[PDB]
Structure formats: C-alpha cells, structure tokens
C-alpha cells in the first residue's frame with residue numbers, strides 16, 4: 001500500500017549491479033518507469049541526454065536508479081531491452097510522450113505493455129465530464145491518494161525550473177538528487193494501486209492500454225517528433241479519447257459537459273431551502289418551526305416537538321434562571 005513511499009533507492013552504475021537489478025525486475029508484473037535527462041538550453045521539446053532511468057517494480061521493495069550516463073546506453077540496452085520489450089510486464093509511466101521519444105532516439109528501444117497513468121486519469125475525467133486536461137503528478141496524488149508531492153518544493157526541482165544548467169550531469173549525484181529521482185517512480189507505482197484493478201474506476205485498463213499504445217506508436221519513431229499528438233502539451237487528443245475510451249460524459253442533472261451531477265451547482269442551489277428556519281430540505285409551507293402543529297409530541301401532548309427534544313432550552317422570563325417561567329419564585 002503506502003509502504004511504497006518507503007522503498008530505498010539503489011544506484012545501479014556498474015555491470016555487476018546492472019545484472020543483479022535485471023534479475024529482480026524480470027519477475028515483475030508491473031514496473032514503474034521514469035527518466036531524468038540533461039536540461040536543454042534551447043527551445044526544442046526533446047529531452048536532453050539521458051542521465052538516469054528510474055525503475056520501481058512490484059517484485060522488490062527497492063527503487064533502481066540506473067546511471068545510464070556512467071554505464072552507457074549500450075551496456076544498459078543490452079540487458080534491459082528484452083524486459084522492456086516484454087508485453088507481459090506492464091510498464092507504468094506518468095506522461096510517457098517525451099520519455100518514449102528519448103528511449104527511441106537515444107537508446108533505440110520501443111517499450112511494449114506500456115500504460116500511461118496521467119492518460120489514465122484524464123481518461124476518467126473524459127468519461128465523466130468530457131474534460132481532456134492533463135494533470136500534474138502533484139494534483140493527481142493529492143486527488144487520488146491525499147498525499148502532497150513535496151519534491152516540487154525541493155532545491156533540485158527549482159534548479160531545473162531555472163533551466164540554466166544540465167543539472168543531471170554531476171557525478172557523483174548528491175543524495176537529494178537521487179532521493180528526488182526515486183520519488184517520481186515511487187509515486188507512479190503507488191498510483192497504479194489506485195487505478196489498476198479497482199472496480200470503482202469507470203474505465204477499463206485495457207482501453208487505456210490501447211490509448212497509451214497510440215502514444216507510443218506516435219512518439220517512438222527513431223527520430224525526434226515534430227508534430228505532437230495533442231493540440232497543446234497539457235491535454236489528450238479528443239479523437240483518440242473518443243475512439244478508445246468512448247463518448248465523453250457530462251452532468252445528468254443540468255445537461256452540461258465539464259462537471260458531474262455531484263459537482264453541479266444547479267443541483268445544490270435548486271435544492272429546497274426553508275425561508276423561515278434556513279434549513280435545507282423543506283419549504284416553509286412544511287416547516288416545523290413555522291407550523292408546530294405538524295408535530296405532536298410522543299410523551300407530553302404538546303404541539304411543536306418530538307420525543308427526542310422534550311427539554312426546556314429557553315431561560316426564564318423573569319430572571320433568566322435555570323428553569324421555566326411559570327415556576328419562577330417571583331410570580332408563584
């Protein structure tokens with residue numbers, strides 16, 4: 001469960017350690033994947049030189065950080081490509097577009113059995129509301145598992161937002177660099193426990209597998225991708241969503257796309273609300289405070305209150321004391 005967040009990382013930077021890592025991963029049924037690369041000075045959308053490939057599987061409580069820079073891609077691909085090509089081992093990404101491009105351009109591999117969970121989350125939004133926006137990991141984690149992505153406030157994350165520096169070319173990598181890189185794959189695997197194999201999720205995993213497969217075909221072409229599959233970087237192709245996920249949903253109460261019945265303001269406003277006692281749920285014509293005759297009492301025979309409320313709550317007419325007005329010693 002949330003034990004995933006406590007998986008230690010392990011730097012894989014030698015051939016011995018690489019072979020040991022591959023052994024573990026090969027028994028996996030799912031492997032979360034992510035890539036850290038040199039930042040680019042330019043305006044190209046392509047990831048820079050691959051530095052780390054991070055992997056976290058359900059086969060071992062450990063995050064492997066493959067130092068692809070030290071190992072070299074040739075060493076790394078020779079041991080990893082069969083596993084990356086194994087469609088019986090699910091590969092979990094969070095937004096796979098540029099990562100898959102880099103795997104294709106820089107490593108010459110194209111993964112199989114890929115499932116993009118950002119695309120999964122948007123698929124759920126599309127089915128329920130006809131929303132095709134991509135959400136960041138921060139938003140999705142907080143929304144699905146109530147956790148705060150605190151790595152977005154870390155020094156590493158700001159160093160890239162500045163963009164002045166490759167960042168990921170330093171060797172040896174500082175501890176908070178590695179811990180930062182481990183968190184991304186930890187979040188991906190943790191997230192898959194909420195989305196994959198959950199009967200309360202309104203989209204079939206296989207359908208999102210088929211939609212993701214379109215993204216991999218579009219982005220793994222051995223060259224940089226000039227034409228993007230989506231109209232803007234932060235959304236998912238609506239025609240693909242329509243083909244693979246189905247017609248987009250909307251509000252069964254008012255009719256509008258963009259929200260569900262449970263979010264509809266028109267439902268919560270048009271609700272019956274009492275002009276006399278303020279309570280929501282009844283009009284004033286049926287209010288018990290305004291018309292106490294609608295309540296005969298179970299234990300005393302007075303109109304206005306049930307059995308669950310036969311106590312005297314209003315203080316004395318005469319002195320304000322803890323009793324009723326008729327029995328005040330000033331009038332009696």
Ligand SMILES: Nc1nc2c(ncn2[C@@H]2O[C@H](COP(=O)(O)O)[C@@H](O)[C@H]2O)c(=O)[nH]1
Nearest residue numbers: 034035036037038039040048160161163184
């Ligand atoms: N220049 C720049 N590069 C980024 C930024 N965010 C991510 N990247 C690049 O994308 C890679 C993967 O980041 P991720 O998609 O795993 O968050 C990083 O290693 C880095 O190369 C950013 O805000 N600015």
Ligand SMILES: Nc1nc2c(ncn2[C@@H]2O[C@H](COP(=O)(O)O)[C@@H](O)[C@H]2O)c(=O)[nH]1
Nearest residue numbers: 045094095098118134135136137233234235
């Ligand atoms: N590579 C890349 N992805 C982006 C960019 N802007 C938005 N995204 C996508 O949208 C997600 C975050 O959404 P946003 O924070 O932009 O609403 C990112 O994780 C990524 O999948 C961008 O400029 N470059």
Ligand SMILES: [Mn+2]
Nearest residue numbers: 034035094099
């Ligand atoms: Mn990534």
Ligand SMILES: [Mn+2]
Nearest residue numbers: 152157160161
């Ligand atoms: Mn970023």
Ligand SMILES: [Mn+2]
Nearest residue numbers: 034035036184
């Ligand atoms: Mn990352």
Ligand SMILES: [Mn+2]
Nearest residue numbers: 254256265266
């Ligand atoms: Mn509205």
Ligand SMILES: [Mn+2]
Nearest residue numbers: 277279288289
């Ligand atoms: Mn009431």
Ligand SMILES: [Mn+2]
Nearest residue numbers: 284285286290
């Ligand atoms: Mn009335």
Ligand SMILES: [Zn+2]
Nearest residue numbers: 015075078079
């Ligand atoms: Zn080897």
Ligand SMILES: [Zn+2]
Nearest residue numbers: 151183186187
């Ligand atoms: Zn984390």
Ligand SMILES: [Zn+2]
Nearest residue numbers: 251253254264
């Ligand atoms: Zn509505």
Ligand SMILES: [Zn+2]
Nearest residue numbers: 274276277287
């Ligand atoms: Zn009322």
Ligand SMILES: [Zn+2]
Nearest residue numbers: 297299300310
């Ligand atoms: Zn009573």
Ligand SMILES: [Zn+2]
Nearest residue numbers: 316318319328
């Ligand atoms: Zn009194």
